[PDB]
Amino acid sequence: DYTAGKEYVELSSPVPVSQPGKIEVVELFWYGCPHCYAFEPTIVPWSEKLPADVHFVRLPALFGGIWNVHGQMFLTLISMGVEHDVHNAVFEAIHKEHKKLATPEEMADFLAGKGVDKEKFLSTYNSFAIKGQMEKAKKLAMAYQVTGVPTMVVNGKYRFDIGSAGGPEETLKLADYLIEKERAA
Numbered sequence: 001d002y003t004a005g006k007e008y009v010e011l012s013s014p015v016p017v018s019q020p021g022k023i024e025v026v027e028l029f030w031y032g033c034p035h036c037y038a039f040e041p042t043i044v045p046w047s048e049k050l051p052a053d054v055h056f057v058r059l060p061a062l063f064g065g066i067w068n069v070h071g072q073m074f075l076t077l078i079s080m081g082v083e084h085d086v087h088n089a090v091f092e093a094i095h096k097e098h099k100k101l102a103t104p105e106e107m108a109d110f111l112a113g114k115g116v117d118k119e120k121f122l123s124t125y126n127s128f129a130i131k132g133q134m135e136k137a138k139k140l141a142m143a144y145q146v147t148g149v150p151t152m153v154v155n156g157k158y159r160f161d162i163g164s165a166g167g168p169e170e171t172l173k174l175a176d177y178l179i180e181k182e183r184a185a
Contacts, residue, residue, distance in 0.1 A: 002174060002177055002178075006164070007160060007164050007165050007166070007174055008158045008159060008160035008164060008165075008174060008178065009158070009159050009160070010157060010158055011143075011144065011145070011156070011157055011158070011159060013143070014155075014156050014157045015140065015143045015144060015153070015156035015157075016156060017055075017155060017156045018055065018057055019055040022053055022054055022055035023053060023054045023055070023154070023155050023179050023182045023183065024054075024055050024057065024153075024154065024155050024156060025047075025050070025054060025055070025056045025057070025152065025153075025154055025155075025175055025179065026057055026058075026059050026144075026152065026153040026154075027043060027056070027057075027058050027059070027150055027151075027152055028058075028059050028060075028061045028141060028144070028146050028149050028150065028151045028152075028153070029058055029059075029060065029061060029149050029150050030060065030061050030063070030067050030070060030071070030149050031060075031070045031073070031074065031090055031091060031094055031101075032066060032067070032070055032094055033149050033150065034095065035149070035150060035162065036091075036149055036150045037091045037094075037095050038168075039150050039162065039168055040088070040091065042168040042169060042171075042172065043150075043168075043172065046172045053183070054179055058074070059137055059140060059141070060072075060074045060075065060137060061141055061146065061149045061151075062134060062137050062138045062141060063141070066102060068134070069101075069102060069103070070101065071134065071137065072125060072130060072134055073090070073101065073107050073125070075130055075133045075134065075137070076121060076124045076125045076130055077090075077111075077116070077121075079124055079129065079130060079133070080116065080117075080120060080121065080124060082115070082116055085114070085115070086111060086114045086115070086116060089114050093110060104121075104122055104125050104126070105122075107121070107125070108121050108122050144159055145159065146159065148161065149161075150162065152171060152174075152175055154175055154178040154179060154182065155178070155179075155182045157178075157182070158178050160174055160175075160178075
């Protein structure tokens, strides 16, 4: 009962998924995005309930400038295996504390207060591996043809957002439907 062209669109060139064999669900976001921050209370509990044949992943939108800096912070924290602990603190710092987290040094200093090894964070942030992940994330955003956040992509095939779905819970209901659609092939 959803309609292609209305609540979601189908990408003419489907994008490969990060984990072959599971239905992918991507949330594209930016730590500095107030709507992304506001969406967290809805998308987190939902994501924790996803079944085992679904792979949920957050992808930072690398649209330039501060988005890229913040995105590089995200990727560095994921690589370090500590993003999920400090995830909420980063959002809180940017939106409630007015912290800019605009340079690697400001980031390290702040994250150290949250338990994150400063020396490892900085070495990782500047590593070739993270540079490759940034390159991939950029190309992905280009392939999804995403121009704002938060935006969802299901299985590299369907793009939608809170506006198109008609609200944050409606967005997840739409994701559920499209996950089911992809199961059916």
